[PDB]
């Protein structure tokens with residue numbers, strides 16, 4: 461399995477090879493919406 | 496007396512040297528069997544999908560638990576994950592790229608779509624089967640779930656409970672963005688939060704016999720809907736049923752939340768604190784707990 465992509469864009473797995481941006485759900489920031 | 500068969504199916508692969516999985520299997524099967532009750536002429540069929548090592552593990556667990564306290568007739572059947580994989584692949588190949596982790600089309604992902612083409616995999620003698628996850632805990636006699644087949648409306652092929660996290664609010668973001676007034680991804684009671692695959696009443700006869708269902712299996716239909724919904728997933732059957740469930744809710748008999756009370760709260764802590772409750776709320780006498788995302792089930 462993979463870990464869900466916390467980003468709203470790109471593939472379903474986090475660190476989608478074909479993604480460069482990460483649009484986070486409201487309230488979150490970072491390359492994996494950490495803080 | 497005329498013998499009546501009841502069929503259950505559970506995935507049980509990679510179980511060797513996997514104590515966490517064996518413990519879940521233990522929790523699921525012990526509660527199932529302790530609480531199950533069937534008439535004299537009725538036989539409970541337990542189908543397990545396993546590779547050879549997990550078959551041996553399942554047998555050792557099963558002899559410890561059979562025969563059941565209630566004394567009813569119980570038959571154990573194993574199916575080869577590699578045999579089922581090859582049978583599924585032609586049917587299931589085209590949907591893998593949308594619903595598998597991550598890209599694109601791997602044999603090892605095919606089995607996670609078993610339920611979508613189960614009517615083509617099981618012998619035609621089996622008219623209905625209930626597929627169950629091994630991270631459940633039964634709180635009632637499973638025989639009672641079978642009567643939900645009777646509540647299927649014309650045209651419905653599958654019985655399934657809603658997804659209780661906003662994972663699909665998240666998944667459908669772009670479609671939601673382009674359609675402000677959509678119920679796709681909204682919480683109950685009026686929204687469509689998608690489905691959870693933990694408990695599925697697969698009416699194989701209705702699936703075989705549905706012109707609509709059969710069309711949705713075709714590569715170009717899968718592709719058309721995935722594009723319309725901008726849908727990407729990694730949860731397999733769950734993601735496919737969820738998607739076609741948005742287009743064609745007629746196909747699904749929605750089970751009450753107490754038949755699959757999910758306990759995973761992973762999405763609460765990942766951007767959905769506000770709305771989480773609206774999705775997660777389930778009230779009534781719980782019939783089955785689903786300790787999903789490795790969430791311990793209460794006792």
Ligand SMILES: *[C@@H]1O[C@H](CO)[C@@H](O)[C@H](O[C@H]2OC[C@@H](O)[C@H](O)[C@H]2O)[C@H]1O
Pocket residue numbers: 462463464465658660662691759761762787788789
């Ligand atoms: C996103 O990834 C996380 C971390 O691996 C998973 O735990 C999530 O799955 C959980 O939420 C959605 C439910 O439908 C799953 O049964 C549950 O494991 C996944 O969406």
